[PDB]
């Protein structure tokens with residue numbers, strides 16, 4: 175792995191980053207092709223490039239792109255990369271969109287608030303551990319029934335929307351033992367959230383609209399924050415009134431209730447809901463396309479495990495007896511990371527290596543990793559583009575080191591020192607719970623795919639119940 179200069183060019187200072195983003199958003203093949211073509215052009219998995227949003231929302235679009243399993247890990251090393259205000263890349267949404275505060279996700283570990291706020295969330299998680307499984311069953315059973323009816327009535331049932339409502343209803347129940355639907359919020363939370371998220375991420379979001387529409391009004395200037403305050407406040411009122419026990423733990427940690435509510439709202443709506451809104455449909459899709467053989471093997475493992483080690487109910491002890499289910503969730507997180515982009519700013523001069531070279535990174539340079547390419551490295555995973563259910567079973571566990579959906583090796587856990595997802599254990603558990611409730615109720619099912627900015631819109635067409 176001989177030392178080499180990083181290939182790639184940032185081009186003319188204002189012209190290039192705009193041209194590059196047009197390619198990124200409208201070029202044939204999408205952002206995937208954007209990265210694959212440069213890879214081919216430079217015969218390298220590491221190269222220089224501009225990234226959106228460009229020219230007005232961002233004052234520095236320059237980055238070093240990482241696409242292989244060997245160089246990517248640098249993004250985890252907080253001793254070498256700073257993780258300040260780069261949660262969303264080369265720009266940061268306005269803090270007016272977050273109560274005037276810089277919430278946890280944007281804080282570098284060297285910031286006192288990072289440890290405080292993260293500990294606050296660890297509290298919120300731990301403090302709900304006994305509601306997770308019970309509330310999940312209740313919430314998702316509701317969802318499934320609803321889907322069965324809709325299906326029985328129209329032959330087809332869209333999953334996304336109603337799944338989002340379930341996700342949010344589930345979170346209020348688990349996190350705060352509250353049903354958001356039994357409040358002013360009704361079933362509109364998924365809509366209020368998406369709306370608020372649009373304002374934050376518009377600069378880098380592809381809504382599938384014509385460039386002559388997206389460029390002038392989504393990709394050049396930040397959207398006026400005052401327009402979304404009405405919406406934001408509705409969410410704020412909910413959390414402020416139902417997160418009392420967490421808000422108090424905050425003050426004990428040294429954080430005012432105000433700043434607590436804003437951070438809580440963010441973690442639940444942005445971090446959690448945002449990730450689940452994507453993770454679940456994707457998991458449902460991969461499973462659905464796996465075939466009947468897998469459906470039977472899963473239904474079989476899960477039911478037997480529940481009955482033999484759960485005594486009729488779902489319990490941690492039982493989940494531990496479902497090796498295929500565990501692998502199935504891990505494969506879904508590997509093949510299609512819910513949140514693909516991770517950034518890191520070099521705190522000093524150091525070197526990194528890809529599979530065939532070494533590169534010098536100079537202090538201040540922005541490192542960027544497109545996870546989907548990194549976790550599909552053929553030199554790590556055989557048949558990387560295929561969904562292999564038992565990939566992580568038995569000896570497969572030796573690879574968990576490479577599943578990076580949480581912005582860290584799956585084998586590691588979030589700490590106040592690192593920037594790994596604070597709810598890592600929670601999402602893996604609730605995802606396993608999703609698969610579980612799915613195969614207790616059904617033996618098999620079929621789906622059809624649509625198109626959207628979430629990747630794939632899933633629609634259920636058949637539901638063979640257990641009975």
Ligand code: HEM
Pocket residue numbers: 257260261278279280281288292295299441442445446447448449450453512513515516517579580581592593594595596597598600601
């Ligand atoms: C499947 C759903 C989820 C996915 C895919 C996901 C993904 C991620 C990723 C990729 C990061 C790293 C961002 C970066 O610095 O570049 C992150 C950070 C974080 N996530 Fe999640 N997350 C999920 C659910 C949750 C949940 C449910 C919580 C709630 C407690 C949570 C809390 C956090 C926090 C607090 C951070 C920042 C931690 C820090 O500042 O060190 N996440 N998440």
